[PDB]
Amino acid sequence: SDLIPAPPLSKVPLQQNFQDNQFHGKWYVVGFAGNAILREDKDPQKMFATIYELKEDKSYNVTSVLFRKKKCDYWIRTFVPGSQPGEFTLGNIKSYPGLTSYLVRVVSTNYNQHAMVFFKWVSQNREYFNITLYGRTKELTSELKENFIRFSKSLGLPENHIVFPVPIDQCIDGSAWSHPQFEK
């Protein structure tokens, strides 16, 4: 079975006059849609966070923090500025065997609340992509979430390939200090 084909970059807008400094810091994964992700409601994906640290050389050190089994997991990698502002490629791709390309395109952001970012990669000659909806908080509006579904569908993704990860406290919010909620 083949994957839904990756859309042409023509269908994927680029945030105009992208501001690398304002994009920095922590984002939560509020939505995640892609040709290799399947929504599964019995044991749903938990929310994770991705921290973008802008380096002197204007690359990002990008650190994803996830809760997996009963430990914190990480994916640390470098996003190197690409051909246009708001585009990046994966640094040290030589160290990812079978990965022949990895492209990042910031679609839209207002920097202080939300962003949508497109990722496309090629691995053992198959084409993969996702769209991420990032929030500065763990919840976004229904409007931002329906916009994300719309955009996802415009790139060829049916609803069963669109996931809204369940908010969590462990690992991803190092300062939430959660406790039992009064009249939750």
In angstroms, rounded to a whole number, what is the distance separating the alpha carbons of residues 170 and 67?
Answer: 6
Contact map string, positions 74 to 113, toward ligand ZCQ, x by CB under 6 A: -x--------------------------------------
Is residue 64 a contact point for ligand ZCQ (CB under 6 A)?
Answer: yes
CB of 130 to ligand ZCQ, least distance (A): 5
CB of 49 to ligand ZCQ, least distance (A): 9
Cβ contacts of 72 within 8 Å, gap of 6 or more: 65, 66, 170, 171
Question: Smaller CB distance to ligand ZCQ: residue 64 or 170?
Answer: 64
Q: Are 25 and 113 in contact (CB under 8 A)?
A: no
Residues found near ligand ZCQ in the complex (CB under 6 A): 50, 64, 66, 75, 130
